[PDB]
UniProtKB/Swiss-Prot annotation:
Monomer. Homodimer. Interacts with FGFR1, FGFR2, FGFR3 and FGFR4. Affinity between fibroblast growth factors (FGFs) and their receptors is increased by heparan sulfate glycosaminoglycans that function as coreceptors. Interacts with CSPG4, FGFBP1 and TEC. Found in a complex with FGFBP1, FGF1 and FGF2. Interacts with FGFBP3. Interacts with integrin ITGAV:ITGB3; the interaction is required for FGF2 signaling. Interacts with SNORC (via the extracellular domain). Interacts with glypican GPC3. This is Fibroblast growth factor 2. Acts as a ligand for FGFR1, FGFR2, FGFR3 and FGFR4. Also acts as an integrin ligand which is required for FGF2 signaling. Binds to integrin ITGAV:ITGB3. Plays an important role in the regulation of cell survival, cell division, cell differentiation and cell migration. Functions as a potent mitogen in vitro. Can induce angiogenesis. Mediates phosphorylation of ERK1/2 and thereby promotes retinal lens fiber differentiation. It is found in: Secreted; Nucleus. The lineage of its organism: Eukaryota, Metazoa, Chordata, Craniata, Vertebrata. Heparin binds at residue 8. The gene is FGF2. Phosphorylation at Tyr-54 regulates FGF2 unconventional secretion. Several N-termini starting at positions 94, 125, 126, 132, 143 and 162 have been identified by direct sequencing.
Amino acid sequence: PKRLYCKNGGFFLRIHPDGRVDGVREKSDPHIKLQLQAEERGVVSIKGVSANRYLAMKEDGRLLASKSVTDECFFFERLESNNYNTYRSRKYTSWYVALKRTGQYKLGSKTGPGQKAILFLPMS
Ligand SMILES: O=C(O)C1=C[C@H](O)[C@@H](OS(=O)(=O)O)[C@H](O[C@H]2[C@H](O)[C@@H](NS(=O)(=O)O)[C@@H](O[C@H]3[C@H](O)[C@@H](OS(=O)(=O)O)[C@H](O[C@H]4[C@H](O)[C@@H](NS(=O)(=O)O)[C@@H](O[C@H]5[C@H](O)[C@@H](OS(=O)(=O)O)[C@H](O[C@H]6[C@H](O)[C@@H](NS(=O)(=O)O)[C@@H](O)O[C@@H]6COS(=O)(=O)O)O[C@H]5C(=O)O)O[C@@H]4COS(=O)(=O)O)O[C@H]3C(=O)O)O[C@@H]2COS(=O)(=O)O)O1
């Protein structure tokens, strides 16, 4: 398990028990602890431990969490330079998981491979 800390603003990814996704700064938040499970090399589903919900990306780029697994709940995890990680949707293949600088998430339909918003340094 671990926390994903976004390089764009220093916000940790957070999955609430209601299915709401956002980024926090409080590093002791219980909702940022996540669990990543591999569906084989490169693919992973991300799960918010407490909430018990999986991060899912919708077709309009919005980000949210679902009690159950769906094709919108798997991401290609790629290790970048300096150890930052990026999560791209296995279904909306050119869309990444990302947070803006204000802390709120950023529509996957406005992301890209060289954005600071998609970078996450994982912290146990
Ligand atoms: O609505 C839109 O669609 C939209 C799109 C348009 O872009 C724009 O529309 S327009 O009409 O105005 O044209 C507008 O953009 C807004 C963004 O959508 C919004 N994005 S967000 O995700 O919601 O937050 C927001 O963007 C801010 C974000 O931080 C970020 O956006 S993102 O998409 O990339 O994620 C972006 O960050 C900039 C950063 O501010 C720049 N810094 S600088 O001071 O201007 O130079 C720049 O950072 C670069 C440095 O240039 C680079 O310097 S160097 O010369 O290359 O060395 C430095 O590099 C680091 C390197 O990262 C380190 N690597 S590490 O160790 O592995 O970590 C290390 O090597 O050290 C290097 C040196 O760092 S040092 O300075 O400390 O010495 O840092 C990088 C860096 O990324 O940090 O560029 C980034 C991103 O690249 S780019 O997009 O500029 O090309 O932009 C932020 C921002 O500009 O505020 O706000 C946008 C503005 O909208 S608004 O304010 O007008 O409303 O909307």
